[PDB]
Design brief:
Chain B: One of its GO terms (cellular component) is membrane. The structure is a homotrimer. With about 325 residues, chain A is of the alpha/beta class. Chain A contains four helices and 39 strands. In chain A, the strands form seven sheets. In chain A, strands 10-13-16-19-24-27-30-33-36-38 form a ten-stranded parallel beta sheet, with no helix packed on it. Chains in contact: A-B, A-C, B-C. The structure holds ligand O4P, the ligand CC1(C)CC(=O)c2c(nc3nn(-c4ccccc4)c(O)c3c2-c2cccs2)C1 (2 copies) and magnesium ion (2 copies).
């Protein structure tokens, strides 16, 4: 939906320098922007390049203004303003509009105002959908689960039974919330299933990427705090608790009963042991092997990175035989002393 | 709801308390209220049992003196907990009866008391045994057979010519029987090898969510009886998993791997193919399995987490460990 | 499906030795093959074993021929011939046939000739499906997405909006193409979602496995080249670019804005970080931890393999304390240097 540059600047709390009557149709990268587009500059090295940008307007700082070759929106934080103006001008469609005739909705489900449910979605008994909730095509929402106002599920999302999801969440396709945790007792080598009768509680403003799995708790609950962001294909095991505003990048695997504090950042492909705690304000870099609890804030890392194969072969053999190397060092220390 | 005396009988536990107590469900020790039964395994909880508000606590004999409520004595409280949770299970069924929106090929063979959920799709030639439950939105491909008592949750995908035994359970998002990753090369161009093998899943198999089990190239991918597989796992074509083996979340297996019985593969492990792991092998989390394993026991790999400042130095020295080795050899020669 | 051996041999450009009138009904492994099956031998150690194989015909080399105990098709490359003959005798069914009445298709969708759409699939407005496209049951294809002629989706595949897929592609079930990239800004300690309005562009002859995810770009596009093959459980982040004919094995994770060249081979469970480039003809072995750009072709590797747990505990402790070992070595060198 087009907008006048002056009106866009007002909504962004930005200082307009140029023609307020310019009509902005959408956001584009600096290299792709054309007439009608607004873009942004975060790297002052592109000041000399602005004359090569064909956008109708550019978001920049006060220091950048003398280098402009277009209408400019001056702000303190061009990146944040970019996020805000991309939401104003978002072209992303909704997962559904209205309630599709092919959706199958139990008579006991409770629908709020302005709820949309896509084709062939399945809503179980007792489900409660808040105002403005959107359920994509082909989703399944299990018995008695509740989804808060403004939350949206893309196509082919699976929500099991007794799940609680807060307001203004966003869940991408393929995600499964509330499957059985990996709970079994061993009986003379045979695995005896332990029913998982806990739930999943997801807070407000949670975003979950595609094909992520969040299992329900065994007795008490798996809990996702407010404002948490989770990338694609993470495994959040039963009775994991993730604190508010924590970010979990793609492909992270967590074991059961792990507690992650608030304000943490878990890098992609990390692996985290269970029945332990990570305190607030912890950053684990990508592929971290998290075996022990983390009790102090800060940045933690693991992994021996890539080498040419010929070189790696020796690195690996030497590390595997490092005990012998250690004994040789000690022996030579004694001989010299 | 069940009387404590009757529950203790079905669990073969010795009752120490009022058997007329009504038990309505299971709860954790910290959450239990009147009417709940709970359990304890770690002796550290003996001391605040007076604070637990459960109507009954499953415990061992040595725990009995510390009991502050009715108690059921057993040898293995965790196994008894498993059993009593099944008796008191509240989990609903994926479906009940056959939904009008389900699309079922007329040549499908359905046993007695088969339930198929809304908008599930059943292909031609499919055979569903007695008491099988198919969740909403599932797909079951041509000529696949699912044994009596087995259950699929919503949005499970079974390809064609798949065989699943009795009393299995498959969680949502899982895909059984996709093409294995098989290709020939014709001057840099990948040439697809059709994957016309199958997947054979035994009895009492439980598979997690968003797990993938590829069909074999010519012969079959085989999952033994009693196997349990967690979420986000990849089981490549022609993998064979022995009975009662457990695979934790996020495990990736390459093609033609053979795993024995009673194994335990820790989460996020990576197991390479065309090799065998013997019975009774445990691989700890993130294990990097490159070589065959021929002796039972516990195996591990990986350098664990350190503070970033410390890790920088560790990784740099490790990557230059060959120079360290050469310097040590030189020093030995000089001395 | 069934074919005379002589005709099969002709289509494979193979030299027939034996009865061309034999009727071949399918392909089977050497151990499983029975009458009517054709099989193949790539390992000459099985020459002594051919008398135990009950296939009606065996594909082999000229050097193998004296060891045959059946009709033989002689070729230069038995493995490639096996791929070709398995395609000829393929028993894999199609994901769908015709347009299912339970499918929900927007009136503005444009369908080519001989399109098939499986039961309960959902096709959004503006979608374009090329000739001979097959959409499996339960799929979702989002607004304005385009799927090229001959391309096929198995059941329960999710294609978001504004996605472009080329010709003769194949996508296995549970895969998600075009979900939001992992993009967020920071407003005084609060995550602010960055709309991901780029796309995914997939070329021709691309094969993608099951439960793989390929996110759309933030502004510009995530791009998959022609002839690329991608295994199960892979994660391709926003704005990744993959060059033609590259192969990505199962469970690989690629972070945002990674560019991978042509003819690369990425081993299973590798982790490739973003905002960097990997040149043509690079092989990364399994579980490789890629933190830096790769500018020369060749084979690269990382990882310390498995050991018995008691041994690993000692290895891990010594490695974690390697800075102390380095300092002791340097001290000893000074002593040996008489300083
Ligand atoms: C050197 O060991 C480690 C290295 C890193 C993490 C943990 C490590 O030790 C603990 C461990 O291995 N587990 C708890 C595994 C097993 C459970 C039973 C047998 S193995 C596991 C299961 N589900 C999981 C999900 C994620 C991660 C691990 C698991
Ligand atoms: C949420 C945010 C705006 C900022 C952020 O913190 C972050 C983001 N995207 C990431 N992708 N990957 C990744 C993905 C796959 C493989 C390897 C790495 C990370 O590790 C990512 C991280 C983090 C870095 C360190 C801790 S979290 C985007
Ligand atoms: C595409 C191809 C026809 C040939 C190929 O190169 C390849 C294939 N399948 C693989 N599976 N795994 C794997 C999967 C899971 C865990 C561990 C390993 C690899 O690493 C694989 C590789 C590669 C090896 C080295 C680089 S890519 C089949
Ligand atoms: Mg329908
Ligand atoms: Mg992984």
């Amino acid at each position: 939906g087009s907008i006048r540059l002056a009106d866009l600047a007002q909504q962004l709390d930005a200082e307009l320098h140029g023609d307020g009557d310019i009509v902005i149709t959408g956001v584009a990268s600096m290299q792709s922007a054309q007439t009608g587009h607004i873009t942004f500059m975060v790297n002052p090295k592109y000041r000399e390049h602005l004359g090569l940008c064909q956008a109708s307007a550019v978001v920049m700082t006060q220091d950048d203004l003398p280098f402009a070759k277009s209408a400019a929106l001056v702000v303190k934080n061009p990146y944040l303003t970019y996020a805000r103006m991309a939401q104003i001008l978002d072209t992303t469609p909704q997962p559904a509009q209205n309630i599709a005739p092919s959706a199958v909705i139990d008579a006991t489900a409770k629908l709020g105002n302005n709820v949309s449910i896509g084709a062939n979605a399945v809503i179980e008994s007792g489900v409660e959908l808040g105002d403005n909730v959107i359920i994509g095509a082909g989703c399944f929402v299990g018995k008695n689960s509740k989804i808060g106002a403004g939350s949206r599920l893309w196509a082919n999302v699976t929500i099991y039974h007794e799940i609680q999801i807060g307001q203004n969440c966003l869940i991408q396709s393929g995600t499964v919330v509330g499957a059985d945790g990996f709970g079994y007792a061993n009986d003379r080598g045979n695995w005896v299933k332990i029913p998982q009768i806990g739930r999943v509680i997801i807070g407000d403003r949670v975003e979950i990427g595609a094909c992520t799995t969040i299992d329900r708790g065994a007795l008490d609950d798996t809990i996702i705090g407010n404002g948490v962001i989770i990338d694609n294909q993470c495994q959040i095991a039963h009775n994991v608790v993730i604190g508010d505003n924590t970010a979990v990048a793609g492909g992270v695997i967590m074991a059961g009963s792990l507690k992650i504090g608030r304000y943490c950042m878990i890098g992609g492909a990390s692996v985290i042991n269970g029945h332990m705690e990570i305190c607030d304000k912890v950053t684990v870099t990508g592929m971290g092997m998290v075996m022990r609890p983390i009790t102090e804030p800060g940045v933690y890392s693991s992994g021996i990175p890539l080498q040419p194969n010929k070189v790696w072969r020796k690195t690996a053999a030497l590390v595997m035989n490092i005990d012998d190397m250690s004994k040789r060092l000690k022996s030579l220390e004694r001989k010299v002393n």
